[PDB]
Scaffold this active site. Structure first.
Site, PDB file in Angstrom:
ATOM      1  N   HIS A 137      10.369   3.702   4.445  1.00 59.89           N
ATOM      2  CA  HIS A 137       9.502   2.573   4.118  1.00 59.89           C
ATOM      3  C   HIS A 137       9.618   2.045   2.692  1.00 59.89           C
ATOM      4  CE1 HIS A 137       6.267  -0.278   4.526  1.00 59.89           C
ATOM      5  NE2 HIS A 137       5.613   0.296   3.530  1.00 59.89           N
ATOM      6  N   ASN A 176       0.810  -1.217   0.000  1.00 57.32           N
ATOM      7  CA  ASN A 176       0.000   0.000   0.000  1.00 57.32           C
ATOM      8  C   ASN A 176       0.856   1.287   0.000  1.00 57.32           C
ATOM      9  OD1 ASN A 176      -2.655   1.176   0.067  1.00 57.32           O
ATOM     10  ND2 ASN A 176      -2.367   1.632   2.248  1.00 57.32           N
ATOM     11  N   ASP A 207       5.897  -4.858   2.440  1.00 56.82           N
ATOM     12  CA  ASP A 207       4.680  -4.326   3.089  1.00 56.82           C
ATOM     13  C   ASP A 207       3.575  -5.402   3.106  1.00 56.82           C
ATOM     14  OD1 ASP A 207       3.226  -1.881   4.235  1.00 56.82           O
ATOM     15  OD2 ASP A 207       1.981  -2.234   2.449  1.00 56.82           O
ATOM     16  N   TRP A 208       2.371  -5.092   2.631  1.00 56.68           N
ATOM     17  CA  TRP A 208       1.324  -6.111   2.600  1.00 56.68           C
ATOM     18  C   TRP A 208       1.645  -7.243   1.632  1.00 56.68           C
ATOM     19  CZ3 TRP A 208      -1.823  -7.185   6.233  1.00 56.68           C
ATOM     20  CH2 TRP A 208      -2.282  -6.168   7.093  1.00 56.68           C
ATOM     21  N   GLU A 216      10.893  -4.208   4.727  1.00 54.65           N
ATOM     22  CA  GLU A 216       9.822  -3.474   5.385  1.00 54.65           C
ATOM     23  C   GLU A 216       8.545  -4.312   5.461  1.00 54.65           C
ATOM     24  OE1 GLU A 216       9.277  -0.135   6.776  1.00 54.65           O
ATOM     25  OE2 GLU A 216      11.373  -0.567   7.325  1.00 54.65           O
TER      26      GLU A 216
HETATM   27 CL   LIG Z   1      -1.204   0.001   5.128  1.00 53.14          CL
END
Ligand SMILES: [Cl-]
Ligand SMILES: [Cl-]
Length: 298
Positions: A272, A35, A101-102, A125
């Site tokens: 990030h 995201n 991330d996701w 990350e």
């Molecule tokens: Cl998020």
């Protein structure tokens, strides 16, 4: 550098279209973004694995990038169904995952549930123990804590994200990247999200983060992923940055002492979206690690 010199292909998954980059040939390296990005995030890294002799496969998650925008909730459960379906559609096997991330949650879950199909995993990350799950908003600090509470509050989150496009317009360029993203880069990142409704996935994702036990599904998935990570024998590669966000130095130090078969590559300054600050170190890193390990799935 802001250029995206790849044509995209499209495939039907669970009744909807998934768009994807597909470059090179042979063993697949599957890139999974989070995201609020898309396959665009990997544009400067992909050429390294192609030149290393691999097939670079980078899909846009459902409702993101150039993928379809079906009327769904865009929860973790939803996203895993489309990515698993995507893997099936392409018949991907003996995969190297490159995840963020996701994308790291979806990726690790796939490796966890399909250990016979995943050769190796590069991540950065990531939403993974020891940092995740989060015990409370307070545990996230005076900035991210209240911000995520806001995003997860009815009406507040909708106003910030759907009406204001806050994740794309602020969190991504201001908080998640050290350098300034160019106008061409921002145009590419905002292109999938011109309307209120289109922005739903960027609002639902922060609502999926497991904080204080909620939501239960993502919490379970992150915890089980953590168990997989500590037990899996397969080659792994971690990129991290200073100060980082999900993975500050002490988190990395813990992981480096406890995850089996883990190579760690510091990239320097970043928070990030490390791919935007150090794509060449990351690209060179993956290629070198693959050259030495030549990983294949059992
Ligand atoms: Cl998020
Ligand atoms: Cl670089």
């Amino acid at each position: 550098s802001s250029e995206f010199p790849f044509a995209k292909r499209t495939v039907e998954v669970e009744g909807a279209t998934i768009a994807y980059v597909d470059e090179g040939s042979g063993q697949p390296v599957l890139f999974l973004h989070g995201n609020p990005t898309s396959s665009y995030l990997w544009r400067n890294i992909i050429p390294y694995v192609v030149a290393a002799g691999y097939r670079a496969v980078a899909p846009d998650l459902i409702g993101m990038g150039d993928s379809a925008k079906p009327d769904i909730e865009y929860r973790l459960q939803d996203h895993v169904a489309y990515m698993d379906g995507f893997i099936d559609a392409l018949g991907l096997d003996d995969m190297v995952l490159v995840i963020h991330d996701w994308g790291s949650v979806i990726g690790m879950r796939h490796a966890r549930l399909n250990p016979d199909r995943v050769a190796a995993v590069a991540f950065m990350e990531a939403l993974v123990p020891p940092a995740l799950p989060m015990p409370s908003y307070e545990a996230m600090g005076p900035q991210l804590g209240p911000l995520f509470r806001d995003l997860r509050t009815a009406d507040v989150g909708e106003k910030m994200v759907l009406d204001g496009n806050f994740f794309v317009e602020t969190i991504l360029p201001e908080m998640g990247v050290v350098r300034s993203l160019s106008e061409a880069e921002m145009a590419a990142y905002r292109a999938p999200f011109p309307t209120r409704q289109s922005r739903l996935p960027t609002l639902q994702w922060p609502r999926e983060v497991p904080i204080g036990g909620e939501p239960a599904f993502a919490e379970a998935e992150v915890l089980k992923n953590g168990e997989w990570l500590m037990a899996s024998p397969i080659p792994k590669l971690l990129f991290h940055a200073e100060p980082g966000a999900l993975a500050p130095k002490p988190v990395v130090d813990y992981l480096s002492e406890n995850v089996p078969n883990l190579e760690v590559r510091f990239v320097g300054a970043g928070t990030h979206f490390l791919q935007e600050d150090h794509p060449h170190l990351i690209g060179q890193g993956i290629a070198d690690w693959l050259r030495r390990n030549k990983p294949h799935a059992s």
